[PDB]
Each structure stands twice: as C-alpha cells, then as structure tokens.
Amino acid sequence: SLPQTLTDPAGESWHLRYDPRGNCIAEVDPLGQVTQYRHDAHGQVVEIIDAAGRSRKMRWNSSGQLLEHLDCSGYPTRFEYDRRGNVKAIIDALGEHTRFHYDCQGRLLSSQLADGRA
Amino acid sequence: SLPQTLTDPAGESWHLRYDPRGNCIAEVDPLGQVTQYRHDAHGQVVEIIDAAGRSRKMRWNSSGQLLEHLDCSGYPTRFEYDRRGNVKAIIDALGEHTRFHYDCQGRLLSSQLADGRA
C-alpha cells in the first residue's frame, strides 16, 4: 500500500518510484526536477542528492540515532549520546560544544555552553 | 587591648608577641615550640613557618579573597572568582577543575566536576 502517483486539483502530478524493499529512492515534481535518496541496510537514509548535484551525507547509530550530518560542503555537525539514550552533547563545525544534563526520566534540567553560561 | 600572655589552670602559659601594627608575628607554646607569621601590607597572612622549618605560602586578592595556596612542598591549589564575588571554580594540584553555578543572591544551584557528573 504505497502511493505511486499523486495528483493535485489543478492536474499537476507528483511521481514516486521505490526500492524493492519499499524504501523511497527518487521523487519527481511537476517541474521535472528530481530528488534521489540512498537507504542503508536497516532502512535509514544516508545520502540525499537534490537538484544541481548538491549532496548531503549522514551516519547513523545502531540504536537509530543520528551521529554525523554534513552539508553540501565538508562542514560536519556531530552528536553524542548518553547511556539512557538522550542527546548529551552537540558539536558544531567550529568545534564549540553544548552540553545537556537530564533526569532519570529524561526531563531536561540544565543546558550549558562552552563560554560557561548555563 | 591585645593579650600578651595566657595561663591555663595548670599553670602552663602561652606567649604572643606582636607587630607594631597589632598583627600577630609569633606564638610560643608551653613546650617551647614556636610558630611564625608574615603579614602583608593590608594585614593578610601570606607565609606560615611552623616548627621544623615547614613553610606555607599564599597569595591574596585585592578584595580579600584567597587565590593560591601552597603546602610544605610546591603543590598549589588555585581559586577563581566570579563578578559577584563567589567561588566560581577550584583547581587542584593535578589540574582537575570543579565548577559552581550560583544564583543572583548567591544561593548555590549546581556543582559540577571534570568527569562530567553534576
């Protein structure tokens, strides 16, 4: 039960073609501009190719949690996770760190920056 | 109104001799063991010489706040103060940092270690 074609009231149509496993591989808009996706073994998207050749890449964690994201250029943002599975820290391109401290139930308590403000 | 000599009920006596400014310079116990102090311009103790030649040195802040303390050997512990005048951080000999975050009224909110626990 997957949609192959969608039609707007004006008549313009959106086209989708899938992988044999059901994962979306490409989408096409009314203007003809295409978008491409690559899916990993576990069904998690790892590369996006938009029009004009722009490419984004990603790395995923074994528990289904994003680790590294890259933009059109080589400018990564990275993530770090705690034992309970929450977002402990976030690292930007320049290397600045932002830290978070949660509760046992996951309820946020404090947020903190590199400059020291909290 | 400064005490020069003190006597216990048993008869043993403690002797003190002062600086012309009133600052304690030396103390003598019943056993004869002496203790020496050096006072800075503003009346803050900077060096303690106990018996057997053991020496401790200190540096003070312009607002009356301790900065560096040294033991008999060259093993310093340092302090760092915030704008409101509270103890922001403490540094041990090995270099481990402990951080504190206060309120506007000075009431403590969080304490944090180098390993990340809070």
Side-chain angles (χ1 to χ4, degrees):
Chain A
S1 296
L2 297 173
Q4 187 181 26
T5 289
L6 302 163
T7 294
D8 305 332
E12 295 292 359
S13 58
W14 302 73
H15 296 168
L16 298 82
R17 62 181 70 97
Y18 293 86
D19 181 293
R21 298 166 59 195
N23 297 132
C24 53
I25 200 76
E27 306 181 7
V28 186
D29 300 350
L31 302 170
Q33 58 190 10
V34 307
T35 305
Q36 303 168 2
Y37 300 69
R38 284 186 52 254
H39 293 257
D40 207 6
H42 297 292
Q44 282 176 126
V45 197
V46 301
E47 191 174 348
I48 299 89
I49 307 91
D50 303 326
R54 305 296 187 275
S55 183
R56 304 182 182 196
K57 299 185 291 180
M58 301 188 294
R59 302 192 305 94
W60 298 85
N61 184 18
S62 66
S63 301
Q65 294 180 312
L66 179 50
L67 290 172
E68 184 183 3
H69 181 97
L70 299 82
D71 309 338
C72 55
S73 175
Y75 301 152
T77 302
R78 309 196 300 279
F79 305 68
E80 299 185 348
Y81 298 89
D82 54 3
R83 295 182 175 174
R84 293 193 174 92
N86 295 292
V87 191
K88 182 176 70 63
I90 293 169
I91 311 179
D92 303 357
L94 274 50
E96 303 299 339
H97 303 59
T98 63
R99 314 290 284 272
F100 301 76
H101 296 165
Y102 306 80
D103 244 322
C104 58
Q105 304 168 3
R107 306 174 85 183
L108 187 72
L109 290 187
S110 176
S111 61
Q112 185 176 9
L113 297 87
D115 189 71
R117 293 177 287 161
Chain B
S1 296
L2 297 173
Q4 187 181 26
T5 289
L6 302 163
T7 294
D8 305 332
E12 295 292 359
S13 58
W14 302 73
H15 296 168
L16 297 82
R17 62 181 70 97
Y18 293 86
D19 181 293
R21 298 166 59 195
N23 297 132
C24 53
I25 200 76
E27 306 181 7
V28 186
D29 300 350
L31 302 170
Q33 58 190 10
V34 307
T35 305
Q36 303 168 1
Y37 300 69
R38 284 186 52 254
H39 293 257
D40 207 6
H42 297 292
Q44 282 176 126
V45 197
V46 301
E47 191 174 348
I48 299 89
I49 307 91
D50 303 326
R54 305 296 187 275
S55 183
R56 304 182 182 196
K57 299 185 291 180
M58 301 188 294
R59 302 192 305 94
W60 297 85
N61 184 18
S62 66
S63 301
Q65 294 180 312
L66 179 50
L67 290 172
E68 184 183 3
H69 181 97
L70 299 82
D71 309 338
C72 55
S73 175
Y75 301 152
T77 302
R78 309 196 300 279
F79 305 68
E80 299 184 348
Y81 298 90
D82 54 3
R83 295 182 175 174
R84 293 193 174 92
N86 295 292
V87 191
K88 182 176 70 63
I90 293 169
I91 311 179
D92 303 357
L94 274 50
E96 303 299 339
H97 303 59
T98 63
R99 314 290 284 272
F100 301 76
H101 296 165
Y102 306 80
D103 244 322
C104 58
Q105 304 168 3
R107 306 174 85 183
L108 187 72
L109 290 187
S110 176
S111 61
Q112 185 176 9
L113 297 87
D115 189 71
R117 293 177 287 161

